[PDB]
Amino acid sequence: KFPRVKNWELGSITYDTLCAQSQQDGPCTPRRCLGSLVLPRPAEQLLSQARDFINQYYSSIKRSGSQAHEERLQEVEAEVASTGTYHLRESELVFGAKQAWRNAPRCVGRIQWGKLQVFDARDCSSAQEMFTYICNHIKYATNRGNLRSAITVFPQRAPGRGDFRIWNSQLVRYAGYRQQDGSVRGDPANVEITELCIQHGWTPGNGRFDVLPLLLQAPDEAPELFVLPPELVLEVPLEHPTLEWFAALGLRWYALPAVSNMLLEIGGLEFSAAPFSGWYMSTEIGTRNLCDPHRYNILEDVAVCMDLDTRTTSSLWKDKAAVEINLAVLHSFQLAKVTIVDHHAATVSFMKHLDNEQKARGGCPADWAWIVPPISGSLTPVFHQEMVNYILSPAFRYQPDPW
Amino acid sequence: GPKFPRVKNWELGSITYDTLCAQSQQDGPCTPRRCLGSLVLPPAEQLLSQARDFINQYYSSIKRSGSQAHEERLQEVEAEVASTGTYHLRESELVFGAKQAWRNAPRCVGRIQWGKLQVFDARDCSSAQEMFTYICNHIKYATNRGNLRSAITVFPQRAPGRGDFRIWNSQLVRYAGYRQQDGSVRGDPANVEITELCIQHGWTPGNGRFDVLPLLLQAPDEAPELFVLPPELVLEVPLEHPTLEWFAALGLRWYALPAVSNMLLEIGGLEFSAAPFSGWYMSTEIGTRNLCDPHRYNILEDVAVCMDLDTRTTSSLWKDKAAVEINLAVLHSFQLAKVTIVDHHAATVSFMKHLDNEQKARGGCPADWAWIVPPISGSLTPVFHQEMVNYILSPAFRYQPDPW
Ligand code: HEM
Ligand code: HEM
Ligand SMILES: CNCc1cc(OCc2ccc3ccc(N)nc3c2)ccc1Cl
Ligand SMILES: CNCc1cc(OCc2ccc3ccc(N)nc3c2)ccc1Cl
Ligand SMILES: C[C@H](O)[C@H](O)[C@H]1CNc2nc(N)[nH]c(=O)c2N1
Ligand SMILES: C[C@H](O)[C@H](O)[C@H]1CNc2nc(N)[nH]c(=O)c2N1
Ligand SMILES: [Zn+2]
């Protein structure tokens, strides 16, 4: 019933009891673990999810059973009974957004969960308005390199009406230009979105790091195209501390990781456009974004600059180049005074988070395969920590691409 | 479409479906409410069903499913359980079973090799001395002076009302772990308990960082007896670095042969409590886990200081740098000594090929992602980007409680 969770570096044993609060099914069954899969394969429903959330909210401020609690439950019940739905008070929304981050099993950065600026953009009626909110989000979150976590929340979904959607997966993304000679200039993860932009009338560039426009969509309307003011988008040229040739690669990355394709669910209400940003862990850029084969794929180029043996795997040329690239990202962001965390500091902070959550709730939902970094796994403490994975609401969820 | 798990490779974009998982009879630790996949250790009627199942598997493998000999073997096994409460496997059944157990092992990245496994039948063994002889032969055969060969030696099965054959050590080769009076550990901390068990049983202990442990061997209903391995049987590789000349002076070494000996081999409900097996190392096992784990030899800081790295800050990536050079030293020295080894890139590539083989051969392959992905350079290898389905097929290797 209650899972025995062991740390194999220290011998420590905990027991997760938070998992009992899980109301949603994951992809595993006793016959097969599907834990490594990236994506997933009436009115009393909503009402019970609403009651549960309001109950959480009032417990958070230590006022359970009180008359403000009991009254808020009836407001929620009266509205659902008459309209099939209801609305969150802003304070509740602020709470809900923090819990969704706190509950995100794949996020290594949750030590920060209580510090989150929440912009209420539920009074949005057009793509143009959505653009203003996004520009402001970016300005606030970027704060000249002293990054600050933020989320902007657009109107929730409503029955028989199209969704508010940001078509881009992140607020800032580099273009992917498919050359007709088989290759791709720019970021191959972004080929499809780049093509959507062009079809919607964007005039494309031809660099490896062309910042994409935002395609914003208000309900049942064609998406509209907005170019982000170049001064809003802070970027960091990459250079290496000892390899003077590194900067000559023209490599660079943007400061702000702002995810915009996820759906935020609070108390049974769904928010299809709710972009959020924190700051980068260095490996995201250094390992995944630049070294992944289906991305910028720079491993070989850097290895040759380093004059390593490329002819054989046993010279570990890949491992060596990757370390230097990650070092270039850390150095450069620190040089440009932009908030960034290395994977050792991050994982160490995540262990402290686990301990805080253990005392606070009796567990912490965590997805080992995502929490463990993409290089130097067992060299971080999270590797040796067993983790229980489950779904708590409020939550961030994936949703289909709107096209 | 298909009512089976869909499996994606995110590098290549390719999709497969796992139908093999339908063959699983034993439940794992996960439920719809929570995934426990990262957890390291989570009657004649029952026997007969497992026995019938394995006999069906065996006859399938030789393409005689539904045949007269198949049905006679079924009747033969049932009648044997009917009078003894257990049954016995034929030689070729044991060979097929042992190989299928390796094939079925979700955590093993080396399964491309699964059909080339030398199976030594040792079901005649009747003493601890004789266990020693068999073990020595295994080591000689498998070590083959550096040109390593996969092998398993299978000792008599669990019998009703008779003690188990057990090998107390977790591997046939392991370094002593000597607990110091100043709290620390000399040698391998992983092996503190078995070292103390060896001493309690009469072994005169050394005081090195790399003292090879004696074997504690247990024949049925008898106390374990102690056997020292003749040193020439135990191939070691001194560690040096291709370009960093000082690395040799660290005096580090590792043994050639990884030979796991505490696992239980299960076949058709028959349980072989002693069935040590061995292949060859993947370099990250030695270079990353055994030598760099904090709770193992923990040499990361030593090496980083020799490399003159800034160890006062995480963001210098000193751990990452030292780790790479240690791994490189493992590879270089094993190659120089001409002792079979595989780096984590070559291994993971070979595992992708294996997944493709098994997709065609069996409609899928049970695989534990957290264990298949290597402990350094994870996403630099192709398996990181490969979704995997994990489940228990039988025949299997299983963990078993320690004899004491
Ligand atoms: C403040 C610093 C933060 C750091 C260092 C951090 C770190 C990370 C990293 C490394 C990942 C893995 C992402 C990947 O490989 O694609 C991740 C995932 C995630 N993060 Fe954070 N994060 C931070 C802030 C936030 C904030 C403010 C939110 C939302 C309020 C958030 C929500 C999430 C979610 C929902 C995931 C999982 C995405 C998925 O399931 O695909 N994070 N985080
Ligand atoms: C031939 C070369 C082989 C290589 C390179 C190889 C590689 C590996 C590696 C790296 C692991 C991870 C273990 C750990 O980190 O603790 C592993 C696990 C495992 N291997 Fe293989 N292996 C090989 C041969 C074999 C053979 C011959 C057998 C048995 C007949 C076998 C059975 C297993 C089993 C049962 C595990 C899982 C152990 C556990 O679950 O705790 N392997 N292998
Ligand atoms: C799961 N496939 C990639 C994917 C990642 C997503 O999130 C990545 C993500 C999410 C939140 C983050 C927060 C901070 C940070 N530095 N990186 C972060 C990275 C969202 C949608 C998709 Cl489709
Ligand atoms: C659970 N981790 C410790 C443990 C590891 C075990 O096996 C590790 C193992 C098993 C087989 C291997 C075969 C080849 C190889 N290179 N390494 C191999 C490593 C068995 C039991 C235990 Cl208790
Ligand atoms: C197949 C595998 O589950 C997939 O590639 C995962 C593994 N772990 C990850 N971990 C993080 N942080 N981000 C990712 O995109 C992934 N991808
Ligand atoms: C807690 C976690 O499951 C544990 O550290 C695992 C992770 N993956 C592993 N992978 C391999 N190959 N060997 C191991 O011992 C482990 N340990
Ligand atoms: Zn699972």
Curated annotation (Swiss-Prot), chain A:
Residues 32-403 are annotated as: Interaction with NOSIP. Zn(2+) binds at residues 28, 33. Transmembrane segments: none annotated. The lineage of its organism: Eukaryota, Metazoa, Chordata, Craniata, Vertebrata. Belongs to the NOS family. Homodimer. Interacts with NOSIP and NOSTRIN. Interacts with HSP90AB1. Forms a complex with ASL, ASS1 and SLC7A1; the complex regulates cell-autonomous L-arginine synthesis and citrulline recycling while channeling extracellular L-arginine to nitric oxide synthesis pathway. L-arginine binds at residues 170, 279-280, 284, 289. (6R)-L-erythro-5,6,7,8-tetrahydrobiopterin binds at residues 36, 369-370, 383. The chain holds residues 69 to 482 of 1205 of the full protein. Produces nitric oxide (NO) which is implicated in vascular smooth muscle relaxation through a cGMP-mediated signal transduction pathway. NO mediates vascular endothelial growth factor (VEGF)-induced angiogenesis in coronary vessels and promotes blood clotting through the activation of platelets. It is found in: Cell membrane; Membrane, Caveola; Cytoplasm, Cytoskeleton; Golgi apparatus. Heme b binds at residues 107, 398. This is Nitric oxide synthase 3.
From Swiss-Prot, chain B:
Residues 34-404 are annotated as: Interaction with NOSIP. Zn(2+) binds at residues 30, 35. It comes from the Eukaryota. Heme b binds at residues 108, 399. It is found in: Cell membrane; Membrane, Caveola; Cytoplasm, Cytoskeleton; Golgi apparatus. L-arginine binds at residues 171, 280-281, 285, 290. (6R)-L-erythro-5,6,7,8-tetrahydrobiopterin binds at residues 38, 370-371, 384. Produces nitric oxide (NO) which is implicated in vascular smooth muscle relaxation through a cGMP-mediated signal transduction pathway. NO mediates vascular endothelial growth factor (VEGF)-induced angiogenesis in coronary vessels and promotes blood clotting through the activation of platelets. Homodimer. Interacts with NOSIP and NOSTRIN. Interacts with HSP90AB1. Forms a complex with ASL, ASS1 and SLC7A1; the complex regulates cell-autonomous L-arginine synthesis and citrulline recycling while channeling extracellular L-arginine to nitric oxide synthesis pathway. Belongs to the NOS family. This is Nitric oxide synthase 3. It comes from Bos taurus. The chain holds residues 67 to 482 of 1205 of the full protein.
